[PDB]
Amino acid sequence: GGAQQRELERMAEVLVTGEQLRLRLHEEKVIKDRRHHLKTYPNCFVAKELIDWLIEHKEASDRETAIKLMQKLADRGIIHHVCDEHKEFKDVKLFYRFRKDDGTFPLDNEVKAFMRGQRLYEKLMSPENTLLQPREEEGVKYERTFMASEFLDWLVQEGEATTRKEAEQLCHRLMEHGIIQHVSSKHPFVDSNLLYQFRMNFRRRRRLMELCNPKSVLKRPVTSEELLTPGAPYARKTFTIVGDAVGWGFVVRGSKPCHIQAVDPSGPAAAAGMKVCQFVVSVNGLNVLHVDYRTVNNLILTGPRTIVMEVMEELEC
Amino acid sequence: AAFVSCWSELNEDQQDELIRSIELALTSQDIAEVTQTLLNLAEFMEHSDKGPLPLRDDNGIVLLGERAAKCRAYAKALHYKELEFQKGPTPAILESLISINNKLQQPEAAAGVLEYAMKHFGELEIQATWYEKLHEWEDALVAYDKKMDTNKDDPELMLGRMRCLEALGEWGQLHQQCCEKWTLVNDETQAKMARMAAAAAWGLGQWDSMEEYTCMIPRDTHDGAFYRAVLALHQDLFSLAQQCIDKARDLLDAELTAMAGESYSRAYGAMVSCHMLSELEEVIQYKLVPERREIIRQIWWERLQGCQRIVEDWQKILMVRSLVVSPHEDMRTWLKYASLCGKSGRLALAHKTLVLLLGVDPSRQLDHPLPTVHPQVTYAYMKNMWKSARKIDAFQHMQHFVQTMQQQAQHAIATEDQQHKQELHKLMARCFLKLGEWQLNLQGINESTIPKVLQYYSAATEHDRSWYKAWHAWAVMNFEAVLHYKHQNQARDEKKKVTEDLSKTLLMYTVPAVQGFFRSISLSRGNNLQDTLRVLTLWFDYGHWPDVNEALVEGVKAIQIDTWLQVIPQLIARIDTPRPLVGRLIHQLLTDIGRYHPQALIYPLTVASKSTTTARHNAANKILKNMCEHSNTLVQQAMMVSEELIRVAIL
Amino acid sequence: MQLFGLVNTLLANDPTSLRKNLSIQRYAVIPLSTNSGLIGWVPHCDTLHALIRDYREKKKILLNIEHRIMLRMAPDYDHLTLMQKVEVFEHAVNNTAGDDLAKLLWLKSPSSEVWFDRRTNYTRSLAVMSMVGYILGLGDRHPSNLMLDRLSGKILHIDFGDCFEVAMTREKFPEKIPFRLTRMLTNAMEVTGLDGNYRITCHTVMEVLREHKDSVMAVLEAFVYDPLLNWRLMDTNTALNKKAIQIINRVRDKLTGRDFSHDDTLDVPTQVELLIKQATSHENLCQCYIGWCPFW
Amino acid sequence: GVINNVLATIGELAQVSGLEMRKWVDELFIIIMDMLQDSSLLAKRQVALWTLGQLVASTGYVVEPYRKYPTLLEVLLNFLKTEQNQG
């Protein structure tokens, strides 16, 4: 796959295997806190004993192979001696700790891109991001195909990169690393239909030896011009409501007709009729047949304590 | 006494006539005063040899419990309800037992009742309402979720789960459940919904929805009047707001009076309602008087710290002030709030709070470093992140943060910003301290960490001299290093040149320790026991060296003489230390303890003065000879009294 | 008593503990010689053994009823095997209502309102001294060595002659019980059991002590290392410096929570639960010397 | 009626003072608490309680008065059991 695959992926692969190894070792209890004659050492694993563990699991055939594999990890920095570093791995009862255990944790730009890509792949594997599907572009069907335009939308929606420009730039870095490659010609990431394939897959790691807010209660959809026509469905009525210490207790939430949204059953309005299924066209004399509900809400508050209101009062139709 | 005298004479037939009449009085036309008289009679009869009066079987364990409950004699209720429990355990009994404990302000006892239910009855018998009473909102939600999945949706189980959501504060999920179910609901549950639905809308800041819900709340409810008054202040209806608040206070009459009658603790709930009411009065001024604003903030800050540290109460209070004060305009309020959420074990809400203050999501921007703007906020996030078991990130951020801080300090240090510069040093100091404690938890104790964590604590000490924790932590670090190196010699040398090198090495770490402990003693000024004992351990072991003695001499002068009274026993134990330079300074120290507060010294000294071994009694007498000159009367009195008491003690 | 002063300071500083009014009842101790000294007399106190004796004579109950039941069923109790002892002990417990202390706390109290307050203090004070006694290592807690305040209701421990697990070390009548958590004390608490006030109080006390482990360690190290007080450790043994090192390490493990297993650290809730099981285990209780009264 | 009009004036000064009366707050608080307790005082409790409100409000004396005057919480819960006027 060229220099890009041979270098970056190999670095990625050893890190993925090292992480797989660390999780396995913790389950096997190889890495455990130790105290040497009242001198503690947390999250430690003895170098000499580890070789035996590797032989049992068949990762390393003999002492040579185990040392070589661990030396490769040391040349990367995935592990470090708890005390002053001994550099090349040695078959001695000595305490070592992983970099990812925060002992040193040397970060780099490649690692951050790799780690983010790995985390994204877990999201892509999960149902949460189901963009991965078999799809055909340029006459060829490939698995794990997700449109580049769809991916950019998903990043903003998911919140991994809220800014589209930042999201698109991040993919270019991954494309340079090779984490994501366009299916056919490795075309650089663009907000287009361009189908992409994930070259790096976290699963099946390598082996050591191989290294609705609003509410609407009005049934009538629209009454504009339905009311204006004289007679027929409704009979007009005028309601005069007196102010109260606790307020009138009614809400109007009709865009054009300004229908009454709700009425307080214990309030003065409910005592003087004022049922929920009503429409208003004039308040305190002024005709408000065609205005917004909020504008009417401004007028009723700015008006006097006693409000003159006209209710359409549909007759059960 | 009259009753017992009579009740003994009666030949059982008259006792039944009496007991039947007692039943009628309790059962029918019960009067509080008569009841508590007859309850005190039943308790008095329990203490009597005759035994409790047998009424309608079981000694009226059910009736007297019901009667004590109406009398609000919750201790009598508990005792009687426990007698019934002893005969048999029932779910009904457990429920009443729980409610009794909550009324009695004994939360721990009620929690134990739930543990009994878990073991002996399992899970089905535990209703979700039981968690609700115990304020186990996390476990109540699990119960209401399990119940509402299997059983068909019911008004009661819906309100129960919604009530839990508002206590947790999950306003997102609570507002979705509201919008979904309005027409599906009856008008009775509708009125029980809006009080919780409005809270959710208010939390999200959607004022149109909030107006719809508040109208559905009954006016008669005290809470409903307050909610209406809130939509007044949103619409700037100041005149109507004051009217609504007054009616709200009027409705709180009944609640405040009833709770105040039986202990202050029950009245606390009502007290919080008036707290929020009078704060709403101080929002009208805040919206009218720009000149009064900074006073209001100081008042608000001082008031909230007097209030109790319960997270529910704070959320209520903060929501009120948030009507006219965005969280950015007052950071310290919401940070202290987040800390309570952290301490109470609800870091999810704490996290949301901190994200809202930060501005962005740090977790999403893993590669990006934490924002520097508002550093006090950032620091709170890191120490939260540590509690969230993301230490690897937190530690790395702290290293980056201090580099930014120290660069932001250097470049921005002008003569003008001196308060800013001083605050930055105080922050960095708290950062440096976290580094050390974290490094030990992450790395461990070994040859490489100790020089590093010392570098950090040293910087912390520089940036905040007066701060107690910076000196104590630095001192304790140095002392541990001295012990660790000594053990290394024992492990390798015991099991010529190395001890002479160790002399320079330990003295390199010993002189810092002495200076630090003496400064950390003065700073604590009343909590220096640990520090003072550590001084003694160091003094006795290594003080025979000239350099360690020198530091101690200046320290013993500097330190106050009241501190040494704590450790008078430990001093006299080593009165005869073979090392001369130690013993000579002990005498000089005891001398000054003698000259002021001799009553603290005479008793242990008199015991040493008559010790069998010569060196102890010789030293003790030499000190007493000097003590005598000041008073002499005490020495003669105590020497006689003690000799006579010994004679008395063993003939 | 210097140690108790330190712990009381720590409890005062913690707000949760302060709200619960947790504290250790302590008294003045003034030595006068190697033999003699003055102890401050605590008023309104009486030994637990006296209370049970006087209650059982009033109610005409035999004072040695539990012992008599055992010797009746199996007169060779002392020489029986462990399993046999467990049976014998259980047979006594099933045929005796172990409610004497709870019942007498009621009768003694003037009124229910006071009674409830006395019991709350009682439960918390016991939990506080259970955890502190475990760390300090205080053994040999037979009912003659603890007395109960008849007004405040708080428990008081006296005569700390045995410390640092001396009782466990001695071959004769070895004590395997870390702290006294017998059934009668449990009955005296809330009806539900140890799950309530006792367990919650133990969690709070353990958390505070673990947080301030350095302060506790400093006090312990100074007096233990003193040559004058070294004699007690030497008597327990069967040199002296080596013995002291082990004792400090054992105490450190308890504070960390590694006492049960050095390899695995234990959280405060888990460690407390394991301690309760050891105290309440029937097998451990049976071994205890009969004078300790494992059946009260 | 003389003391009643003096209290209504002190209450109006409270708001106008704008934190310049803090030095005198402990003096007026003692005086008023002397007048709050008992019904012997001619001055109406209503205006007594009202002016105390204006002082606490404007000057910002919160929580700290509780330490100085421990009976304050017992005094204010006694009016709720005694007073019949709503205001």
Ligand SMILES: O=P(O)(O)O[C@H]1[C@H](OP(=O)(O)O)[C@@H](OP(=O)(O)O)[C@H](OP(=O)(O)O)[C@@H](OP(=O)(O)O)[C@H]1OP(=O)(O)O
């Ligand atoms: O909970 P901690 O991690 O130990 O942090 C505490 C805590 O700060 P928070 O407000 O963030 O919780 C203290 O506040 P309290 O809750 O005890 O009131 C605060 O003390 P102050 O209130 O006096 O500022 C103290 O700060 P400091 O170390 O300056 O005394 C600070 O400690 P750390 O910042 O070192 O964690």
